[PDB]
Write a protein that binds this ligand. Sequence first.
Ligand SMILES: C#CCN(Cc1ccc2[nH]c(N)nc(=O)c2c1)c1ccc(C(=O)N[C@@H](CCC(=O)O)C(=O)O)cc1
Ligand SMILES: C#CCN(Cc1ccc2[nH]c(N)nc(=O)c2c1)c1ccc(C(=O)N[C@@H](CCC(=O)O)C(=O)O)cc1
Ligand SMILES: *c1cc(=O)[nH]c(=O)n1[C@H]1C[C@H](O)[C@@H](COP(=O)(O)O)O1
Ligand SMILES: O=c1ccn([C@H]2C[C@H](O)[C@@H](COP(=O)(O)O)O2)c(=O)[nH]1
Lengths: 264, 264
Amino acid sequence: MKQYLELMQKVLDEGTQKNDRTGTGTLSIFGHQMRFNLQDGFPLVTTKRCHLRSIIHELLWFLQGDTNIAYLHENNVTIWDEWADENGDLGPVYGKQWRAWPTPDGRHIDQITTVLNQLKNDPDSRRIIVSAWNVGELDKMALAPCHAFFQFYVADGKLSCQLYQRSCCVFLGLPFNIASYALLVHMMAQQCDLEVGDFVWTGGDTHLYSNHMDQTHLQLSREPRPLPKLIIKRKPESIFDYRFEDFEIEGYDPHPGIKAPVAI
Amino acid sequence: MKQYLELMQKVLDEGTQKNDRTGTGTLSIFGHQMRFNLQDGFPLVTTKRCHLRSIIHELLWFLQGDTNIAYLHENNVTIWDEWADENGDLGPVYGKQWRAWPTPDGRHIDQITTVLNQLKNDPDSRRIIVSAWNVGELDKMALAPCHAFFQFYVADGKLSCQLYQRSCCVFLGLPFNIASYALLVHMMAQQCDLEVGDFVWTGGDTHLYSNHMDQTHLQLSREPRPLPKLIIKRKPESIFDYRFEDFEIEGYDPHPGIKAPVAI
Ligand SMILES: C#CCN(Cc1ccc2[nH]c(N)nc(=O)c2c1)c1ccc(C(=O)N[C@@H](CCC(=O)O)C(=O)O)cc1
Ligand SMILES: C#CCN(Cc1ccc2[nH]c(N)nc(=O)c2c1)c1ccc(C(=O)N[C@@H](CCC(=O)O)C(=O)O)cc1
Ligand SMILES: *c1cc(=O)[nH]c(=O)n1[C@H]1C[C@H](O)[C@@H](COP(=O)(O)O)O1
Ligand SMILES: O=c1ccn([C@H]2C[C@H](O)[C@@H](COP(=O)(O)O)O2)c(=O)[nH]1
C-alpha cells in the first residue's frame, strides 16, 4: 500500500548502516508513523501476497493468554517454533501479559477485559491501554515484545488504535503486524458496537535487513491495488469466543508472494 | 517553535469535541508525531515565556527515584501539589518506576542505570527502553503516567530519543515535557560521550481544553524566535549527580507569558 511502500523507499534513501545482534547488517531509521483509515478497507498488503491464516491463529492465541506453541502447531502455524523451548513455551510473552499481567503482590490484571469494559463504560477515557512491555518479566521471555504497547481511542462512534513498535523488520514483519492489529480493532469494534476508525502505526527502530535488498526493490516496482474488505460472519458472545472460520477477506487480489530469508 | 504551533493548529483544524473525567470539554486528535533536531537548539517554547526552574527540578527529582514532593517544596516547585496526599506522596509514579520497577520475584529493576549500560555497551540494541506504565501499580498512583514510555537510539555517534505520551495537554503540559526530555537526552549524551540527535515526540490523545482556546489563539498569532542554547558547566561522575547550577540556558528571549487554568 501507499504508506508502506513509502516507508520502504524512506529506509532505502535515509536509512543508516547499523550492525544488528544478528550480524546481518541493516539500513535503519528511527521514529516513523503511518495512519490507516480502516473505513477505506483492510490494510493487508497487495504488492505481495500475505497469508492471514497464521496472522489469525496467532491473534486468537494471544487473546487466550496462551504462551505455549501447542495451539499454533495444532493449526500448522510455525512462526514461534524457532524460539520455543522443549515443551513449546516462550515465557510470559504477549498473551500472558495481555490476560494476566502479574502484580508484585501475586494478583493478575486482565488488560483485555479491562479495555473491553472501559470501551463500553468510559469510552472517553484517555488511558485505554494494553501493555506487553512488562519490565519485571522481560528476562523470562523467549524474546522481548516488538509490538509492545497499544492504545484505543473513541471519537464519533469510531474506534481508533495506535501501536508502538520498538523494533520493525519492514519487509517481513510489518505487513503482518499491521493486519494483526487492524484485525483486533474490528473485533473490539464489533464487541462494543462501534464503527472502525484509524489504525495508527508508530515505530522505533525501523529497518530493512541487507539480504532483503533484492526483494524490496522488486516490491517497489509493483503498483498497489485496491484494498480488500474484512468480513466477520458471526458475532460471538465475547471477544474471546472468535474462531478462525469467523473471518473472511474479500476482494484480495495481490501480486505474487515474495520469498525472503528470516534473520534470527 | 514551528513544530509546536503547527500541532496546535492541527488540533483546532481537525479535532473533535470530547468530555474528560474532569467534566471539562476538550478538542482532540489521536496520534501525532513531532521531530526536534536537538543540534538546532534547545527546544524550549519561545512564543510564550516558560519556567525552566521547575522543569529542571522535576527531572532531578525523577532521576533520584523520589515520589514525595518534599524535595520539590524545598526548591519551591509547586507543579505537583494538587495531586499529592496529606503526606506529600504521589505514590509509585515516574521516579519510582524509573529507578525501581518491582518485579513479581521481589526484585527491583533500575531502568535508568540499565539504559546507560546499554548505551555504552550495546548502543545498537533495539530494546533501550524505559517504561513508567506499570499496569500492576496504576491503582496506587495519584495520576496515571502521561509520558508513559520512551526509547533511545544511537546512530552516527548521536543519541536520539522517542517518547510516547498517551495523553497530552497541548497548551499547558507539552512545553514542559518537550524541554524535560530534551534535557534528559543532553544528560544521557554527556554521560555516554555521544552527540545529541533527535527528540521524537509521539502523542496518543492530544488535546486542547475548552478554557484554553483564547490563550491558544493568542499564542498562535505570535512569531517563533530563535531557539535558546543549553550549556552544561560540568560532567558529573554519574547521571544521578547533576545539580541545578550545572545548567545554563543562554539566548532565551520569549514572548510574554500567558496564564492559563489547569484541569485536575
Ligand atoms: C511480525 C511478526 C510475526 N513474525 C515474527 C518475527 C520474528 C523475527 C523476525 N526477524 C526478521 N529478520 N524479520 C521479521 O520480520 C521477523 C518477524 C513472523 C514470523 C515469520 C514470518 C515469516 O517468515 N513469514 C512467512 C510465513 C507467513 C505465515 O505463516 O503466515 C512468509 O512466507 O511470509 C513473518 C512474521
Ligand atoms: C508536564 C508536567 C508536569 N506537570 C504535571 C501535570 C499533571 C496533571 C496535568 N493535568 C492537566 N489538565 N494538564 C497538565 O498539563 C498537567 C500537568 C505540571 C503541572 C502544572 C503546570 C502548570 O501549572 N503550568 C504553569 C506552571 C507555572 C510554574 O512554573 O509554577 C505554566 O504556565 O507553565 C505545568 C506542569
Ligand atoms: C499528564 C502528565 C504530564 O506530564 N503531561 C500532560 O500533558 N498530562 C495531561 C494529560 C491530560 O490533560 C491530563 C491527564 O488526564 P488523564 O490521565 O488523561 O485522565 O494531564
Ligand atoms: O512482531 C514482530 C516481531 C519481530 N519483529 C522483528 C524486529 C527485529 O527485526 C527482529 C527482533 O530483533 P530485536 O529488536 O530484539 O533486536 O524481528 C517485527 O518486526 N515484528
